[PDB]
Design a protein around this ligand. Structure first.
Ligand SMILES: CNCc1ccccc1-c1ccc2nc(N)nc(C(=O)N3Cc4ccccc4C3)c2c1
Length: 209
């Protein structure tokens, strides 16, 4: 398969290095960030449904699924949101994050906490607090299925997903660090969801193993 490799923009690469090497025990914030991104993707496609009703022909249900898998050591966050095009993954996410990183890093020096990352539109990268590798499968109405991947280290890869079609939405697969397996435990996910995502306007299903 034709795998394309891209360098992260200097600011994002730096933010990712900050997230990976900074001593910070309150790692559970990653979940709230990912669910908050999923809720936004669901708001975007729910808004599109009003003007044009044909955009829902790739799945009518607007929901969030939390899928732990102890065998694979993965925590998957699935949404039936707007999804991303190839341009979204390469250019659009790169430029929105470029401005976000600068705003957040200046705020960190001005008294802000790492838990305030989401206010800068870079909440996604908090995934690297618990994950050694992140794989993103995405499908937008105006494009094909793409798989994005990064183990940080300054690069990401993009390829056309030859795997299982998902219709529309985004699947964030967190390949958890060795010492971060508590995020595969039902009671731990439940407690995090109740504490930080108690008022999300879409159903959140926690899968059992
Ligand atoms: C702002 N939303 C609209 C938008 C406009 C331009 C570009 C994309 C999007 C878009 C659409 C659907 C989304 N759905 C989910 N669940 N998450 C995100 C997200 O913020 N991500 C950050 C990120 C970084 C690296 C790889 C992957 C990701 C994913 C999404 C982003």
């Amino acid at each position: 398969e034709e795998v394309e490799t891209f360098a992260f923009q200097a600011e994002i690469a730096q933010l990712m290095s900050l997230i990976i090497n900074t001593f910070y025990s309150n790692k559970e914030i990653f979940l709230r960030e990912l669910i908050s991104n999923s809720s936004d993707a669901l708001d975007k496609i729910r808004y599109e449904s009003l003007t044009d009703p044909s955009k829902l022909d790739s799945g009518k249900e607007l929901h969030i699924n939390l899928i732990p898998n102890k065998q694979d050591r993965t925590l998957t966050i699935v949404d039936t949101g707007i999804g991303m095009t190839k341009a979204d993954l390469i250019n659009n996410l790169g430029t929105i994050a470029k401005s976000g990183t600068k705003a957040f890093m200046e705020a960190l020096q001005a008294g802000a906490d790492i838990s305030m990352i989401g206010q800068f539109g870079v909440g996604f990268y908090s995934a690297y607090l618990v994950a050694e590798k992140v794989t993103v499968i995405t499908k937008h109405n105006d494009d094909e299925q793409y798989a994005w991947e990064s183990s940080a280290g300054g690069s990401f890869t993009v390829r056309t997903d030859t795997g299982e079609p998902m219709g529309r939405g985004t699947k964030v697969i967190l390949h958890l660090k060795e010492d971060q397996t508590e995020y595969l435990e039902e009671r731990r996910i439940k407690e995090i969801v109740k504490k930080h995502s108690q008022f999300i306007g879409y159903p959140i299903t926690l899968f059992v193993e």
